[PDB]
Amino acid sequence: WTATSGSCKGRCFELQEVGPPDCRCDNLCKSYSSCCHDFDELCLKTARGWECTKDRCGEVRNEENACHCSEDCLSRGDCCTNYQVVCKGESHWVDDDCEEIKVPECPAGFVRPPLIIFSVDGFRASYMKKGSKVMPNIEKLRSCGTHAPYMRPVYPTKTFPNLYTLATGLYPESHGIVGNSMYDPVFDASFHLRGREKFNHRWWGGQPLWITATKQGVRAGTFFWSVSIPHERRILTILQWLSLPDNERPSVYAFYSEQPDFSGHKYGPFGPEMTNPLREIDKTVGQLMDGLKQLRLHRCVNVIFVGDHGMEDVTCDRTEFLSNYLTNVDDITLVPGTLGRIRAKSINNSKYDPKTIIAALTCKKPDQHFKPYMKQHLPKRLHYANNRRIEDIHLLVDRRWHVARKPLDVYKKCFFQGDHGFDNKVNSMQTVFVGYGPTFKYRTKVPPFENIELYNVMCDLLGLKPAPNNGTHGSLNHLLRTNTFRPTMPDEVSRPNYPGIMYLQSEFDLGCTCDDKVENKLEELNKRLHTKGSTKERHLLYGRPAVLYRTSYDILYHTDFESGYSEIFLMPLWTSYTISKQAEVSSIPEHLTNCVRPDVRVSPGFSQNCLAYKNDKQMSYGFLFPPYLSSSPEAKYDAFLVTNMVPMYPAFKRVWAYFQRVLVKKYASERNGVNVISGPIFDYNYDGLRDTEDEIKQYVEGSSIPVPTHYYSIITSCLDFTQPADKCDGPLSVSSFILPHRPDNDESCNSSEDESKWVEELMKMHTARVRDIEHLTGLDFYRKTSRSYSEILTLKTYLHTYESE
Numbered sequence: 001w002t003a004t005s006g007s008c009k010g011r012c013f014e015l016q017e018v019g020p021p022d023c024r025c026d027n028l029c030k031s032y033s034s035c036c037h038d039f040d041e042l043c044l045k046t047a048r049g050w051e052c053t054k055d056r057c058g059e060v061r062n063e064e065n066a067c068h069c070s071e072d073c074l075s076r077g078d079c080c081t082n083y084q085v086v087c088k089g090e091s092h093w094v095d096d097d098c099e100e101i102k103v104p105e106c107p108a109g110f111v112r113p114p115l116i117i118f119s120v121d122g123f124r125a126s127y128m129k130k131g132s133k134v135m136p137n138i139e140k141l142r143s144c145g146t147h148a149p150y151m152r153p154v155y156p157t158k159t160f161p162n163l164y165t166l167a168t169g170l171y172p173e174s175h176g177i178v179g180n181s182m183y184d185p186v187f188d189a190s191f192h193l194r195g196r197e198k199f200n201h202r203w204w205g206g207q208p209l210w211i212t213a214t215k216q217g218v219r220a221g222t223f224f225w226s227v228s229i230p231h232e233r234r235i236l237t238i239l240q241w242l243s244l245p246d247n248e249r250p251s252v253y254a255f256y257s258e259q260p261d262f263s264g265h266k267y268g269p270f271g272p273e274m275t276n277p278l279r280e281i282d283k284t285v286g287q288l289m290d291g292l293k294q295l296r297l298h299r300c301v302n303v304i305f306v307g308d309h310g311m312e313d314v315t316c317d318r319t320e321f322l323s324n325y326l327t328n329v330d331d332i333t334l335v336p337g338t339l340g341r342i343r344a345k346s347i348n349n350s351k352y353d354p355k356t357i358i359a360a361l362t363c364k365k366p367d368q369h370f371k372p373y374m375k376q377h378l379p380k381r382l383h384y385a386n387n388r389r390i391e392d393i394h395l396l397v398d399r400r401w402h403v404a405r406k407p408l409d410v411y412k413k414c415f416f417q418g419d420h421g422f423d424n425k426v427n428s429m430q431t432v433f434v435g436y437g438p439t440f441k442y443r444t445k446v447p448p449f450e451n452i453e454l455y456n457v458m459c460d461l462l463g464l465k466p467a468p469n470n471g472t473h474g475s476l477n478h479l480l481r482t483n484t485f486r487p488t489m490p491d492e493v494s495r496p497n498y499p500g501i502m503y504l505q506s507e508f509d510l511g512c513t514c515d516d517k518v519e520n521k522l523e524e525l526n527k528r529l530h531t532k533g534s535t536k537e538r539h540l541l542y543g544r545p546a547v548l549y550r551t552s553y554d555i556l557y558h559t560d561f562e563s564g565y566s567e568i569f570l571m572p573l574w575t576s577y578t579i580s581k582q583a584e585v586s587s588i589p590e591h592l593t594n595c596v597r598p599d600v601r602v603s604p605g606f607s608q609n610c611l612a613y614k615n616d617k618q619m620s621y622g623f624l625f626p627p628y629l630s631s632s633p634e635a636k637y638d639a640f641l642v643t644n645m646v647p648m649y650p651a652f653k654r655v656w657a658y659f660q661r662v663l664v665k666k667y668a669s670e671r672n673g674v675n676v677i678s679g680p681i682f683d684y685n686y687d688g689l690r691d692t693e694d695e696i697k698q699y700v701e702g703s704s705i706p707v708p709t710h711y712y713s714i715i716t717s718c719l720d721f722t723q724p725a726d727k728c729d730g731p732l733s734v735s736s737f738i739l740p741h742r743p744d745n746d747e748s749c750n751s752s753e754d755e756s757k758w759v760e761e762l763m764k765m766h767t768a769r770v771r772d773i774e775h776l777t778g779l780d781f782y783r784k785t786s787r788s789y790s791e792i793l794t795l796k797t798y799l800h801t802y803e804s805e
């Protein structure tokens with residue numbers, strides 16, 4: 001109930017929403033059907049449109065008009081945005097040259113430069129180039145300010161998850177807006193773009209920018225907008241709020257546009273009908289900038305022009321149907337479209353089998369345009385699992401395609417030519433970022449980055465302390481002239497032991513054997529030097545990784561590699577080695593095929609054992625430093641140390657052996673040497689964070705050897721590849737992966753073929769940021785380089801995507 005018979009007189013677009021059953025006059029009242037009876041009349045004036053004309057100049061004020069051209073309009077803050085242009089001989093902002101804003105140039109009483117966020121729905125990254133001739137205001141923002149070639153959205157590349165990520169710095173799994181629709185099994189409720197359910201705060205986790213601001217005494221404008229408020233009225237409203245008295249005026253403002261997404265769905269991303277919505281958004285930017293310039297705020301405000309996602313060509317005839325795969329299609333519920341999420345139709349049905357649903361969807365047709373996953377098996381880079389609203393079964397849909405349950409779902413609602421939602425690596429889903437203002441740099445291009453990073457920057461722009469989030473604060477300092485943020489390296493929590501030779505061979509009863517007894521003081525002092533760290537500056541190029549949690553571990557030096565060996569998990573946490581461009585690949589000699597050697601630096605009680613592997617019929621083992629890349633037949637024995645061994649399913653060993661035998665050397669040839677850090681990851685509760693020992697769900701049978709859920713590698717080289725990895729004077733170049741440690745290769749449909757046809761494709765799919773590995777391991781990398789820490793933070797957030805140009 002609303003008693004809608006109150007009034008908006010003097011309250012139009014008020015900033016504090018009032019409580020029921022009193023009626024509302026704020027920019028959301030339309031969405032709630034709760035506006036006062038006279039909201040349209042008072043607050044949504046339209047008379048005479050949105051522009052001053054020569055004959056309105058100096059007119060007598062008429063309060064019915066949408067905006068004003070009377071002499072008093074500037075002091076009242078309600079001129080049409082082109083008033084000064086028409087009536088005072090001023091130039092449009094877009095026609096002025098650009099001039100560096102070295103300091104904020106703000107009116108008296110401004111405590112800080114306001115931040116205006118201009119969000120554009122469906123604004124694909126390549127519109128910046130392709131629509132450039134029709135977007136002069138946007139092009140000026142872009143060339144004069146700071147811009148990236150593109151900005152990476154979060155998965156799914158849908159509207160609500162991305163806008164709320166922009167606002168919180170959090171992955172959708174953490175903020176809870178995990179799709180444009182979602183069902184919460186605990187609420188027994190569905191959230192949709194349509195309806196009132198989305199109004200309940202219980203869906204919305206984290207701490208969005210407006211709350212962060214309010215909590216810290218910085219006033220915020222409303223970020224949501226009712227769809228029926230036209231764009232021109234949104235701009236005028238922001239400009240009027242900017243003319244409020246100092247004590248009442250917000251410091252942060254948000255404009256949102258439904259375009260070009262709305263037309264993109266109907267016409268496809270580059271339909272000839274798309275030129276107009278781009279012109280219209282540009283005109284709106286032009287209104288805002290002219291309005292700012294009128295208010296002498298155009299060299300005071302920081303403006304962020306940002307999109308939520310791109311748009312891909314998608315049509316009804318490219319729909320895969322689940323009824324084509326399953327027999328039991330009526331026992332499931334599917335969230336359809338550019339992703340699939342599958343759950344049972346009924347909790348009461350105990351004969352619903354996720355396992356058999358997956359198997360019936362796996363590699364079933366040779367052209368198949370989607371791939372089923374248990375959510376914990378999805379690439380870790382998507383961070384799309386740790387929420388009860390994300391269904392156990394997920395379908396990753398090929399770009400340009402849809403999935404639907406049954407044909408009747410498509411024809412009983414061709415409508416659309418565009419859609420989005422696909423994997424956030426997909427070129428068509430990339431979106432835009434421009435920052436313009438005194439705090440941003442002048443005429444600067446920055447590399448692409450992820451939208452999860454922006455919250456920290458917007459907090460910096462506003463002098464706020466960010467709430468805990470998924471950005472890496474400092475990784476975007478290079479966007480800013482001032483207000484940076486001074487990041488510092490986390491303190492190491494556990495210092496390593498450096499064990500010497502402490503155990504005799506016969507103390508070990510590991511059930512291991514090696515053919516290693518073949519009998520010199522030239523090469524005996526030499527071997528000793530290597531065990532004490534003589535070659536360590538060759539194989540550990542960026543310092544040892546810091547351990548950021550409490551644990552017991554040892555540093556182990558070898559001729560060819562260094563490792564940090566965990567006495568708790570009985571295997572290395574990291575193993576580091578450098579492979580020059582000139583290095584040779586050799587085989588594992590026949591006599592050494594099953595060789596595992598006790599490590600006389602590490603106690604029997606802190607070692608793995610061969611017997612456990614013998615008895616575990618599912619589980620085999622591999623090595624972290626690859627024997628194939630030994631520097632000499634003699635150094636090769638070090639690779640068979642029990643301290644270099646890790647548990648591996650035979651199916652996974654096919655992947656790992658190809659990476660180690662073929663791909664490392666390829667990368668070293670292509671990149672002029674690489675440094676490799678490899679290790680296990682344990683994430684049994686799929687939260688993206690390192691497991692404690694008591695979270696491990698699987699061990700090598702009858703042992704305390706825990707089984708990794710994943711294996712990582714971080715592969716670093718010189719960005720200037722004319723310099724070798726091991727003697728690089730400048731910036732670095734990195735690629736990394738987090739491969740799932742699976743007992744089958746069901747994920748790869750061509751796995752029956754030679755490794756050269758599928759392994760590298762798998763690794764590419766599981767590309768990762770260094771930062772993702774850091775969360776999953778509690779390690780901190782690149783502790784000792786000659787680069788600035790801000791630069792290292794940018795390097796740790798880099799993702800190598802393997803998309804074409």
Ligand SMILES: *[C@@H]1O[C@H](CO)[C@@H](O[C@@H]2O[C@H](CO)[C@@H](O[C@@H]3O[C@H](CO[C@H]4O[C@H](CO)[C@@H](O)[C@H](O[C@H]5O[C@H](CO)[C@@H](O)[C@H](O)[C@@H]5O[C@H]5O[C@H](CO)[C@@H](O)[C@H](O)[C@@H]5O)[C@@H]4O)[C@@H](O)[C@H](O[C@H]4O[C@H](CO)[C@@H](O)[C@H](O)[C@@H]4O[C@H]4O[C@H](CO)[C@@H](O)[C@H](O)[C@@H]4O)[C@@H]3O)[C@H](O)[C@H]2NC(C)=O)[C@H](O)[C@H]1NC(C)=O
Pocket residue numbers: 170171173174175176202203204205206383386387388468469470687688689775
């Ligand atoms: C990305 O960034 C984010 C933000 O930094 C990282 O997320 C944080 O991770 C922390 C560790 O997992 C986590 O801290 C825990 O919080 C518990 C308190 O939780 C509430 O309070 C906060 C603060 O205001 C709030 O933000 C939380 O919000 C969640 O829940 C509501 C729903 O109720 C949602 O609206 C919201 O979207 C959010 O959901 C997400 O998080 C939860 C987990 O909290 C997931 O389950 C969801 O799926 C979703 O992702 C909460 O409202 C606190 O209780 C925890 O403490 C336990 O653990 C410690 C170990 O140190 C121990 O000392 C304690 O004893 C305690 O154990 C007891 O509870 C156990 C669990 O019930 C029980 O089994 C035991 O036996 C004990 O009794 C813990 O400190 C933090 O909440 C989230 N924050 C957010 C916003 O998600 C995220 O990790 C980053 N991602 C990556 C990849 O880096």
Ligand SMILES: CN(Cc1ccc(C#N)c(Cl)c1)C(=O)Cn1cnc2ccc(C3CCN(C(=O)[C@@H]4CCO4)CC3)cc2c1=O
Pocket residue numbers: 028031032159160163164165167198199200201204208223224225226227256
């Ligand atoms: C497309 N769109 C642009 C946009 C702009 C910014 C973001 C973002 N972020 C999003 Cl997702 C979207 C819209 O505004 C559409 N739209 C229209 N009317 C609404 C009315 C009420 C609400 C509620 C949601 C919960 N509320 C919070 O305070 C959460 C509880 C904590 O915050 C109160 C307001 C939401 C909407 C809404 O989403």
Ligand SMILES: [Ca+2]
Pocket residue numbers: 121122158159160261308309
């Ligand atoms: Ca959108």
Ligand SMILES: [Ca+2]
Pocket residue numbers: 682683684685686687688689690691
């Ligand atoms: Ca975990």
Ligand SMILES: [Cl-]
Pocket residue numbers: 156158178179180181182335
């Ligand atoms: Cl969705």
Ligand SMILES: [K+]
Pocket residue numbers: 613614615616617618619620
């Ligand atoms: K075995």
Ligand code: NA
Pocket residue numbers: 745746747748749750751752
């Ligand atoms: Na397969």
Ligand SMILES: [Zn+2]
Pocket residue numbers: 122159261262265420
């Ligand atoms: Zn859309």
